[PDB]
Each structure stands twice: as C-alpha cells, then as structure tokens.
C-alpha cells in the first residue's frame, strides 16, 4: 500500500502546555527546525498515495504501550480532543499549522481518560484495563491515523506513526536548557573562580555546569544551596588541563542535566594563563 513518514518532527523542547483557561489558542506546535525568523511546521509525508482522505492527529504517551494521552489537542479541526481533517491531492506532503497541546489537571485526569474511550480514541488499540493507572502528562507522541485508498477507492488506514517526544517545556524536569547570562567568562586556567550563572528553571537535585574542550572535560563545583530558586547557580570554576597555560584557551560551557543527558547551548569561556 503506502507508508507514513513525518518530515518535521515536533521541537523536542520548546512549547509550554496550556490549560483550557490559558487563553486556549495562543500558539501552535513549531516545526522541528523552526527559528525566530524561519518558522516551520510538522509536515507529514504519506508515500504511496496521491488523492483525498482524512487525518486524525491524536496524542498518546511516550512509551510502547502507547495509551491515548488524556489532555486535548485543541485548535483548527480539533474535535473531541484529537484532530480530523483531510489530504490535499497535488500534495504528498501535508503540514499542520494550527494545533495546541492542552493539558489536563490531575483533578480532571480520569475524566479526560473516559473522554478518551467515549470518543473511540485508541490508535494502536490498547485494552481499556491496560490503558489506565498513571500517565506521563509532561510528554506526548502525536499520532497519525491517516486514511488512504487502495486501487479501488476504498479507504485504507496505514501505520499510525509517532512523533519524536514532545516535552511540556513548562515542566521543570524537562524544559529546555538556557544560560541567560553569566558573572564572568574568563577565569584562571587554575580554576576556582566563582561564577554567577543565570539560567532558565532547573532542578537543583538534577543539574550540572559542563565544561567541554578538546581532550578536556570537567564540571563546575557547586551545591544545592548554591542554586537559587531554580534560576541561578553560583559555582566555582574547574581547573584546566594545563595548570600553567601560555595563551588564552577558549573552551565551552553548557548546562547539563544528567537524567535525560541533555545539554544547553554552549557558551564561550576563556581560560587565561595563571
């Protein structure tokens, strides 16, 4: 028949899930490689078919037994929670510019779930008793239950492919990593220089200041007590490999979260001689 291949995966970490009351529609889901100027959008690529049909963009969970994720995907053509539209003919590459990821309070948890079953939302079909218990609200994998047509005009539902993980950047434990600004960016190649780093919310229990550099790797020394209300870290700089540098070395420093092994954008830092 035909296969589904999502072209613009959803920006891993960027958007912040919104509650109904949160002015509902207040932005969409950015294309994986979106930029401040060049805005992109998640575009699917249904190969093996070129005509009409439908698309039912649903939202499940990030783990194999892909249960349907409780909170709704609102906006353009989004009904009862999911999304259901069509497929352009002279188009074998359709994108979705209009889709917010709304979150469900814990209070409204199981309700949203019943609303998941009362709507017949179950892309891979997982037994009701299985599709229960706990759910990972801070992350989802958009589903694509698109319908094509065999060589006779008969509708055909292909593989419900999943989108790369979408994490509620509002979630402290998986938001994006940013270094707003920093005290100083020079320090001695002997280390020990206290730095004041301002960052986007981080969880003290799970965070580190990572210092790269060809053949050299270390982290700044600090402590829980040194992270201020999740938006600042006062740490001491690490010794450089050469305890008697001869000329400025421009190493890199980025925020590192062990748990998901992710790193912030690198920031210039230059170790100066003794």
């Amino acid at each position: 028949m035909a296969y589904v291949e999502i072209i613009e995966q959803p920006k891993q970490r960027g958007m912040r899930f919104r509650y109904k009351c949160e002015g509902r529609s207040a932005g969409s889901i950015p294309g994986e490689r979106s930029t401040d100027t060049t805005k992109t959008h998640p575009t699917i690529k249904i190969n093996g078919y070129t005509g009409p049909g439908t698309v039912r963009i649903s939202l499940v969970t990030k783990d194999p037994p892909h249960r349907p994720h409780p909170h709704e995907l609102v906006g353009k053509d989004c009904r009862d929670g999911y999304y259901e539209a069509d497929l352009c003919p002279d188009r074998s590459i359709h994108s979705f510019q209009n889709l917010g990821i709304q979150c469900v309070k814990k209070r409204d948890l199981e309700q949203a779930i019943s609303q998941r079953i009362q709507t017949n939302n179950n892309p891979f079909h997982v037994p009701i008793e299985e599709q229960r218990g706990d759910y990972d609200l801070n992350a989802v994998r958009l589903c694509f239950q698109v319908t094509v047509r065999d060589p006779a005009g008969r509708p055909l539902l292909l593989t419900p492919v999943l989108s790369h993980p979408i994490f509620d950047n509002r979630a402290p434990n998986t938001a994006e990593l940013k270094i707003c600004r920093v005290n100083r960016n020079s320090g001695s190649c002997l280390g020990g220089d206290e730095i004041f780093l301002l960052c986007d919310k981080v969880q003290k229990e799970d965070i580190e200041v990572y210092f790269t550099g060809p053949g050299w790797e270390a982290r700044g020394s600090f402590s829980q007590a040194d992270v201020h209300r999740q938006v600042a870290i006062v740490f001491r700089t690490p010794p450089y490999a050469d305890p008697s540098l001869q000329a400025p070395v421009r190493v890199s420093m980025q925020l590192r979260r062990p748990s998901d092994r992710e790193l912030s954008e690198p920031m210039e830092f230059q170790y100066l001689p003794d």
């Binding site: 707003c180 600004r181 005290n183 004041f196 301002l198 919310k201 201020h228 209300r229 938006v231 600042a232 006062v234």
Partner: protein, 313 residues
Amino acid sequence: MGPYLQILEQPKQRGFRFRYVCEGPSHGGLPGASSEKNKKSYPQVKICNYVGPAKVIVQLVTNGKNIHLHAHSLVGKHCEDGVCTVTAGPKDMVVGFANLGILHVTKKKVFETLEARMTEACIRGYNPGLLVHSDLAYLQAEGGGDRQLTDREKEIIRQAAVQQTKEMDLSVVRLMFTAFLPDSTGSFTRRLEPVVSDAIYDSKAPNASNLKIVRMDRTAGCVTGGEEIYLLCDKVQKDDIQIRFYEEEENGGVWEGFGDFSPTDVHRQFAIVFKTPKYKDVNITKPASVFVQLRRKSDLETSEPKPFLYYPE
C-alpha cells in the same frame, strides 16, 4: 460609652503567608509586631473603662475605601464561620488572639463565599448592614432567634454580595474587633465601638513580600561607580524594584545612590544585574563604607541593609 476596644498590639503587617484551603492543616499562625528573639507575640486586644464579663468577636474586613465583609475567613481558636468568638470576661478584659489562620478564597469562590458571610452576620448579632449594605443598619444583636431575611431583604445582601465581589482584594485583609457587653440577665446584646487594625497583606503576594538580598556577586567597587554587580534576591517585581546605596553624614545628612538597571535586568523575579552608582566624592583617598539595600518603588519598603565598600580609583 466607656468600654470599647483597644488594640494593645498588632501583627507585623507583613510576614505571614495567608494559607488557603488545599494547603494543609494549620501549618502556622499570625505572629505579631514583636520579634523579641526568644519569644514572640500575637494580636492582643483589650477593653478600657470596661465593664464586667464580655465577649469580643473578630471578622476579616476589606481594606479598600468602604469597609465591608471580606471573603477570606479566620480559622482555629474560637473561630467559626471565619469569625472568632472569645470570652475573657473574668476580672481583666484583655483578650489575646493567638494561633489564628487566614484562609484564602478561590478567585471564583469569592461571590458564593461572600453571600453566605453576609448572612452568618445578618442572622447573628454582629456587624449587620454596617459591613455589607447600609440599608440593614439593624438586625444585629436584636436578640432575634433568627430573622427571616425576606425575599426582599435577602435580595439586599445579594446585591451587596454582587457588587462587592468585583471590588474585593484577595491579597490584603484587616482584622475587625467588636466586643459586646452583658445586658438583661446575661446575654450580650450591646456592642462597643468596633475597631479595625492595620492590614496584614498576604505573603504569597508579590507586591507586598518581605525584601531580602540573599547574596551578591561582589560587595565593593570603585567610587567611579558603573561596575556590574549580580544580586540574588527573594521574589521581586521587575517594574517595581530598586537597589539603593546610602550613607550617614555628620549631624544631618544621608547620601543616596541607585543601581542602574532595566527591569529587563531582573531575572525571573529572583536576580538583578545592575551597575553601581558613583560615590558621594570620587576624590576620596581611603575606602568608604556605605550600605546597600533593596527597596520597593511603590510602598518604599526596604530590606536588610548590606555593608557595601567603596574604594579609590
């Protein structure tokens, strides 16, 4: 009249975080303007030129321009329906209100909670139409077993419990003290001039919090000023905050400098990147110690002053 309500002490006006309903059971109380270091103090009131036994009540009132019933309710002690009822009518008429809690209402449960509040007082003998609507100037300690608030008179409390719902200020509240003395047999009919205290402003309120400088980047710099300093602080508002350096002069005199920074320089209401100001006299030859403090442009409230040291170029 003679016997009234004297507030011999009051809270600290700012410090306590008025807890809500789903925050847990009495995780604290309302202290008082008295640090002491060893012990402490709660809002203590008394009655001067008093009578014999007497029971004083207390209802949370709204700050605003027109004093009326406040949606929030007091909890614990002799409180019930947000109104504490204390006796303390032995020999002395000094009553201390300790371990009192304040429950914050939902930004939605205001109207509904208000309405009822304006009924628990109407029916009862305390603050009738003198804290709701001045059309029910009576129906207080009239002794009525339970006055049936006519579909007409109950609609008065409704209209009041409707307009006042849009004026309400959920972050500030004031304690009202109303004491009633005995009368005929033993019942407490007659009331003494009710007296409102100061505002206690919720702690979980940004524009009222207690300012503090947890720590700063550097605590010294050149008189020339203009040196960058990092400051980590307790929650503040970018638009309403300022760093202020100051010093004491001979006899009369106080120098004053403000840190140069844009609200954009305030990181998540917890940090500020600013530049030091020029010192009084950039001609000094010896280090001069000044004091730095965090201050709110609105209530001109300050913080614990920190010893900043200026030195020669």
